[PDB]
Scaffold this active site. Structure first.
Site, mmCIF file in Angstrom:
data_model
loop_
_atom_site.group_PDB
_atom_site.id
_atom_site.type_symbol
_atom_site.label_atom_id
_atom_site.label_comp_id
_atom_site.label_asym_id
_atom_site.label_seq_id
_atom_site.Cartn_x
_atom_site.Cartn_y
_atom_site.Cartn_z
ATOM 1 N N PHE A 10 40.321 89.843 8.986
ATOM 2 C CA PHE A 10 41.247 90.958 8.829
ATOM 3 C C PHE A 10 42.451 90.811 9.753
ATOM 4 O O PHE A 10 42.320 90.377 10.897
ATOM 5 C CB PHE A 10 40.532 92.286 9.097
ATOM 6 C CG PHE A 10 39.323 92.509 8.231
ATOM 7 C CD1 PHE A 10 39.454 92.658 6.861
ATOM 8 C CD2 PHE A 10 38.055 92.564 8.788
ATOM 9 C CE1 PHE A 10 38.344 92.862 6.060
ATOM 10 C CE2 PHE A 10 36.941 92.767 7.991
ATOM 11 C CZ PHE A 10 37.086 92.916 6.626
ATOM 12 N N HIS A 34 27.590 89.704 7.029
ATOM 13 C CA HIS A 34 28.811 89.366 7.749
ATOM 14 C C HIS A 34 28.795 89.963 9.153
ATOM 15 O O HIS A 34 28.883 91.178 9.323
ATOM 16 C CB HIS A 34 30.031 89.838 6.953
ATOM 17 C CG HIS A 34 31.338 89.602 7.635
ATOM 18 N ND1 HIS A 34 31.549 88.541 8.494
ATOM 19 C CD2 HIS A 34 32.527 90.237 7.530
ATOM 20 C CE1 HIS A 34 32.795 88.565 8.921
ATOM 21 N NE2 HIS A 34 33.414 89.584 8.348
ATOM 22 N N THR A 37 32.937 88.808 -1.538
ATOM 23 C CA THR A 37 33.920 89.738 -2.083
ATOM 24 C C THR A 37 34.539 89.150 -3.350
ATOM 25 O O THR A 37 34.725 87.936 -3.438
ATOM 26 C CB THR A 37 35.026 90.049 -1.060
ATOM 27 O OG1 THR A 37 35.662 88.828 -0.665
ATOM 28 C CG2 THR A 37 34.443 90.726 0.171
ATOM 29 N N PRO A 38 34.856 90.006 -4.336
ATOM 30 C CA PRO A 38 35.431 89.542 -5.606
ATOM 31 C C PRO A 38 36.684 88.687 -5.425
ATOM 32 O O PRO A 38 36.792 87.620 -6.031
ATOM 33 C CB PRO A 38 35.766 90.847 -6.336
ATOM 34 C CG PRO A 38 34.830 91.850 -5.763
ATOM 35 C CD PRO A 38 34.653 91.466 -4.323
ATOM 36 N N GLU A 91 39.229 81.850 -1.348
ATOM 37 C CA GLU A 91 38.736 80.838 -0.423
ATOM 38 C C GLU A 91 38.552 79.507 -1.144
ATOM 39 O O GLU A 91 38.831 78.444 -0.589
ATOM 40 C CB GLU A 91 37.420 81.273 0.226
ATOM 41 C CG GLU A 91 36.793 80.194 1.098
ATOM 42 C CD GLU A 91 35.705 80.722 2.010
ATOM 43 O OE1 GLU A 91 35.217 81.848 1.778
ATOM 44 O OE2 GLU A 91 35.342 80.007 2.968
ATOM 45 N N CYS A 121 36.872 88.912 12.143
ATOM 46 C CA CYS A 121 35.931 87.979 11.535
ATOM 47 C C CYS A 121 36.034 86.595 12.144
ATOM 48 O O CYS A 121 35.175 85.795 12.039
ATOM 49 C CB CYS A 121 36.114 87.916 10.007
ATOM 50 S SG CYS A 121 36.484 89.444 9.147
ATOM 51 N N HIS A 137 33.695 80.901 4.886
ATOM 52 C CA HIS A 137 33.840 82.311 5.210
ATOM 53 C C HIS A 137 32.866 83.077 4.320
ATOM 54 O O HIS A 137 31.938 83.723 4.807
ATOM 55 C CB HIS A 137 35.286 82.766 4.992
ATOM 56 C CG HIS A 137 35.552 84.179 5.402
ATOM 57 N ND1 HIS A 137 35.329 84.639 6.683
ATOM 58 C CD2 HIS A 137 36.042 85.233 4.706
ATOM 59 C CE1 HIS A 137 35.660 85.914 6.754
ATOM 60 N NE2 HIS A 137 36.097 86.301 5.568
ATOM 61 N N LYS A 180 26.254 83.703 5.028
ATOM 62 C CA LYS A 180 26.394 85.152 4.931
ATOM 63 C C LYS A 180 25.580 85.688 3.757
ATOM 64 O O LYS A 180 25.316 86.888 3.668
ATOM 65 C CB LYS A 180 27.864 85.554 4.782
ATOM 66 C CG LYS A 180 28.749 85.199 5.973
ATOM 67 C CD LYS A 180 29.827 86.257 6.162
ATOM 68 C CE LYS A 180 31.001 85.763 6.996
ATOM 69 N NZ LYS A 180 30.898 84.325 7.355
HETATM 70 K K LIG Z 1 32.006 79.852 8.570
#
Ligand SMILES: [K+]
Ligand SMILES: [K+]
Lengths: 412, 412
Positions: free
Chosen positions: B399, B338, B305-306, B312, B163, B301, B333
């Protein structure tokens, strides 16, 4: 200002599962090439390879976790832990792990697992994909696993540059330390593409040797009878460390990295020209602030290809001038085969060991040197030499026309 | 002390086939996410994606050339040529192409062609393997084709950091220019993994949204109902140039890159922690010599996601302190999905355009902001804003726990 030295070595390859095994094998002029056993290759025009043998990843990490990774990550993790153990960093009290990073690349990555999963999906559907399929094949997860195992929180990523991957990773990591983004970097390359699509892929390019009846002499750089490179697998890893940090603890120091040069051919996607490689060598010597005549040993790219070996020789002549006839060249691929992304890694290790031990590994299988094609340098044919090595360079000229040269120097 | 500015932008993505199309789509809060059309995703629990649509690679290279490449290369080349044309380098007489390099990465690379070739091999054996299979799937061949097309002979390679790939490529390229190894770098990321193994791989990790009935709102960062990220494809490219080199010609300057921060979580393979991302942001700001209070915009980012979106937020609060509540955050995103290795590329473009045009793209699909999970910042919800942006950062937390933060600044 900041100087970068090497305090750790890590290697897994067709000539040994440790650094010592490999060095002894290389100095004895023993081949690591045999018939492919990994898979049935009867259908590929090339059926020989440099395979990693007798290697147990379970010695390094748990078998259950190892199960969830493709083998190129096995090689990378193992060689990394070797280098880290070798540097003694696991025994440093209050080590600043926030200042330690990992940069390990691969040319191709998890091709075997992608093939296996693909076959599973054809036969069973999309629900046969393991939950660990993606992380087990991502190239950057080598660095990922190493940082998690050791608690390193410095910069981490992987490079990709085909044959030049390991060189770029090591050179880049040295840059990182000098810039001050890290005091320590674990760097190198890992490759594991001994599979149907991997071996068959390069064969379709007509890039591989077809001397299947004589595996031991299939790889023969600068020899008259060379017919393509022999694919190999494994990993070579360095621990790079800022000098003052190294000296403060009582670290054993193998050598210093003083130069890093990069270029692009801008000509062919899979065949090196003359000028591109010459540029990289020149740029590296400039970066190191040394002259061609100062170079005692060249660990060549040396793939054993008809055009490549001859073009590399001409590239050396362009960059070195007359000193091309004074220095000593050798291709350890004559024994290891071509490790692709891991090639720059293991050959960095060998170059450093050459300096450290005062020995040059031979280019074996030179039965009749190809002088007619211009290959008339000293390729250290057939036997190792005791030699005072103050400066060694290692060349990598890779697919995509991407070139890298590392310059190592004796530390005193 | 060399300075690096951005003189060229290129983009191919679900929200546009050009930079203009994209920027306009983003500012209007329009989604680029729809049902997967690329292949039959019926057997996968996630059947929505950010697809590139109406894109003709034949506009940039010949059909014959294109056939030899997987689509992530197509996106990379097209976006690169966009940026190069934008910067006006094609029109500079006696341009020193030896001082120009290319650093474009990918997270996964040629996964679709590997799947295709693998099936053909299953159906017909090794003969099926095309001679261009290997070069057509090699990640570093994006840089390879660009150098060859343009005649650039500077440093060239690719990076891989999942990512964070595009962020690392851009930051590293800026370091190269600062160090002196190049005056111009073409840098970014490309990804094309809309395939059975690509989408099915991330679905097997329970990582993707399963809101297949309502594709337009499946990507909803910091929303109460978010359930995983939406996979996207494409490429984002910058032309980086040393300041005096740009000023000496009549270069248009979009912005200046003043900071680059890297870190590792050393925690979880596929789940970000608080401290890791916080480290990267802090390091980027120290590199730039800028206080958190001076940051006007954060391109997050924000993958939807939960756990990720909430972590973040906590990471930003650690790094920014009270200024976490003062700055403006947003996740594009929400509209693009993504793009993996290309995410850092396109989001660098978006961040630069924010500074250039003085506008902030929204985080769409925020119906009920998840304040209970701690997501209580200003995410520019649901509509764009006019704003004077002097400093903007772009975050990527990928990741393997690899983190990268870029700091861009308005140039005067
Ligand atoms: K970014
Ligand atoms: K070498």
């Amino acid at each position: 200002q900041r100087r970068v030295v090497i305090t750790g070595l890590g290697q897994v390859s067709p000539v040994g599962n440790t650094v010592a095994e490999a060095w002894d094998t290389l100095l004895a002029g023993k081949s690591g090439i045999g018939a492919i056993t990994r898979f049935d290759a009867s259908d590929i025009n090339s059926r020989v390879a440099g395979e990693v043998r007798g290697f147990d990843i379970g010695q390094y990490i748990s078998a259950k976790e190892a199960r969830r990774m493709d083998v190129f990550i096995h090689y990378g993790i193992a060689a990394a832990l070797q280098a880290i153990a070798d540097s003694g960093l696991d025994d440093v009290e209050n080590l600043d792990k926030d200042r330690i990073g990992v940069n390990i690349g691969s040319g191709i990555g998890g091709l075997p697992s992608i093939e296996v999963t693909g076959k599973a999906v054809i036969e069973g559907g999309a629900r046969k994909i393991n939950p660990f399929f993606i992380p087990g094949s991502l190239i950057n997860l080598i660095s990922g696993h190493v940082t998690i195992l050791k608690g390193y929180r410095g910069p981490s990523y992987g490079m990709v540059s085909a044959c030049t991957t390991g060189a770029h990773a090591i050179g880049n990591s040295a840059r990182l330390i000098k810039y001050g983004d890290a005091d320590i970097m674990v760097a190198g390359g890992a490759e594991g593409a001994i599979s149907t699509l991997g071996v068959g892929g390069f064969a379709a390019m007509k890039a591989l040797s077809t001397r299947n009846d004589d595996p031991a002499t299939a790889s023969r750089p600068w020899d008259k009878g060379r017919d393509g490179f022999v694919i190999g697998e494994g990993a070579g890893i360095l621990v790079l460390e800022e000098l003052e940090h190294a000296k403060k603890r009582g670290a054993k120091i193998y050598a210093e990295i003083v130069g890093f040069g990069m270029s692009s051919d801008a000509y062919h996607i899979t065949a090196p020209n003359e000028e591109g490689p010459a540029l990289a060598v020149t740029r590296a010597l400039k970066d190191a602030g040394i002259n061609p005549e100062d170079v005692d040993y060249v660990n060549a790219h040396g793939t054993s290809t008809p055009l490549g070996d001859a073009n590399e020789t001409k590239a050396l002549k362009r960059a070195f001038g007359e000193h091309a006839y004074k220095t000593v060249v050798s291709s350890t691929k004559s024994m290891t085969g071509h490790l692709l992304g891991a090639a720059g890694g293991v050959e960095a290790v060998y170059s450093i060991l050459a300096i450290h031990d005062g020995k040059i590994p031979p280019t074996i299988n030179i039965f009749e040197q190809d002088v007619e094609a211009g290959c008339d340098l000293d390729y250290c044919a057939n036997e190792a030499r005791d030699a005072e090595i103050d400066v060694a360079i290692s060349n990598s000229f890779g697919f995509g026309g991407t070139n890298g040269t590392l310059v190592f120097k004796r530390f005193k």
